[PDB]
Design a binder for this molecule. Structure first.
Ligand SMILES: Nc1nc(=O)c2ncn([C@@H]3O[C@H](COP(=O)(O)O[C@H]4[C@@H](O)[C@H](n5cnc6c(N)ncnc65)O[C@@H]4COP(=O)(O)CP(=O)(O)OP(=O)(O)O)[C@@H](O)[C@H]3O)c2[nH]1
Ligand SMILES: [Mg+2]
Ligand SMILES: [Mg+2]
Length: 384
């Protein structure tokens, strides 16, 4: 019958899918403002704690005195038991550890889709704009417990100052959720080598008006036997940025489209954003496609994703042994459900391509991406 071209459906920045997914400048700035609020408080809470440690160093303080001091700082927004732990930890530092703590100032680096520009406007109720802002502690080679308590104190002190904010503890981060604004901010915490951080910060400021060795970037884990895991988020940022330069400007677009497909097919759940990115990069690295037709390119991606996910999707961090998505012999109900929807996507896109009219084509492709694009005039007859 007829054959439709969907390039403008995907890419029109006003009415097309990109126009629906990309945050406005006002919205990006609001997330930047939120990140800055978290950073300022975290630096302030660390200074208050260091102020207490400095008093302990300057003169012998009893545990009860340290407890009272803790209780007058913004650490007061922790629970009473947690405040005791913070006081105990500060009191029990030996002279050497205390000197290291007095020298600590947290540093920050954003990771995830806010950093490499693939953050989509959320679609279904419950979905939220996500800022992943890592907090970094330069140390040699100071306790895991203390560092987690102080970041928790910072986040809880902000929650105590804002109606509708909620703190959530997760295995790999602290989170502040702002449900009414469809926004949350995740704060993973890292330990990094102090000597190397300093040396490279100096070098960086000298070249202006290097990167930390990935092996020593340690992500704090909240529960279990392992308190730390080596996981440098910049590995993913660098791998994705290089992939964009290598594959082209359309990579960021089709990764957004696959994430939006995911958001439309599951209110919560579905394949991780990073697993979609990795599979998509693999396909586009190994299959001929045409960037001037993202409708065609999306068809090619959809055809190949099931097999990518079936063989298992490995992390761009080769030091990470966990797959982003397990191979099919390891699939349980959750993975089988993801395979099912992945297998459906090509069928949906095919149905759209051979619809009898523009409005029918729009309806069919919106089975994949939701009723977000409404302008059927973005869909046009394919050229002879
Ligand atoms: N360095 C690092 N290593 C870890 O192993 C890791 N796992 C989680 N985190 C960060 O913790 C915060 C909470 O994460 P989630 O509970 O939401 O789950 C993560 C992980 O399942 C997975 N993921 C993230 N980073 C890695 C990854 N380096 N290697 C393997 N898997 C990883 O993906 C989930 C989503 O994380 P992001 O929000 O960062 C990915 P995105 O591009 O921003 O996607 P979007 O939000 O737009 O949907 C959070 O801050 C994590 O980044 C990690 N950070
Ligand atoms: Mg994220
Ligand atoms: Mg997050």
């Amino acid at each position: 019958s007829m054959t439709w071209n969907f390039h403008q459906y995907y890419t029109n920045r006003n009415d097309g899918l990109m126009g629906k997914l990309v945050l406005t400048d006002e919205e990006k700035n609001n997330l930047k403002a939120l990140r800055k609020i978290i950073r300022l408080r975290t630096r302030d809470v660390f200074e208050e704690a260091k102020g207490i440690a400095k008093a302990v160093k300057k003169s012998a303080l009893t545990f009860e005195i340290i407890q009272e001091k803790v209780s007058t700082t913004q650490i007061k927004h922790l629970s009473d038991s947690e405040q005791r732990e913070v006081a105990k930890l500060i009191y029990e530092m030996d002279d050497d550890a205390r000197d290291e703590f007095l020298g600590l100032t947290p540093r920050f680096w954003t990771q995830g889709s806010f950093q490499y520009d693939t953050l989509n406007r959320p679609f279904q109720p419950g979905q939220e704009m996500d800022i992943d802002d890592g907090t970094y502690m330069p140390m040699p080679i100071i306790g895991h417990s203390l560092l987690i308590l102080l970041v928790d104190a910072s986040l809880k002190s902000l929650v105590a100052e804002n109606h509708g904010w909620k703190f959530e503890a997760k295995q790999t981060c602290g989170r502040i959720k702002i449900e009414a604004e469809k926004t949350h901010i995740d704060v993973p915490m890292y330990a990094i080598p102090k000597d190397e951080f300093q040396k490279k910060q100096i070098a960086l400021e000298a070249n202006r008006s290097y990167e930390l060795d990935s092996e020593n970037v340690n992500l704090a884990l909240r529960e279990g036997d392992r308190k730390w895991i080596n996981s440098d988020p910049k590995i993913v940022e660098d791998w994705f940025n290089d992939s964009c330069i290598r594959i082209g400007k359309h990579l960021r677009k089709v990764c957004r489209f696959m994430k939006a497909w995911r958001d439309a097919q599951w209110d919560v759940g579905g394949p991780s954003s990073i697993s979609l990115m990795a599979a998509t990069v693999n396909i586009l690295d190994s299959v001929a496609h045409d960037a001037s037709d993202l409708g065609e390119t999306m068809k090619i991606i959809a055809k190949h994703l099931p097999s990518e996910f079936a063989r298992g999707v490995e992390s761009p961090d080769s030091t990470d042994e966990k797959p982003l998505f397990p191979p099919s012999y390891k699939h349980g109900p959750r993975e089988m459900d993801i395979m099912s929807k992945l297998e459906r996507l090509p069928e949906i896109l095919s149905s759209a391509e051979s619809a009898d009219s523009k409005s029918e084509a729009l309806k069919k492709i919106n089975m994949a991406f939701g009723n977000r694009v409404t302008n059927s005039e973005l869909i046009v007859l394919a050229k002879a």
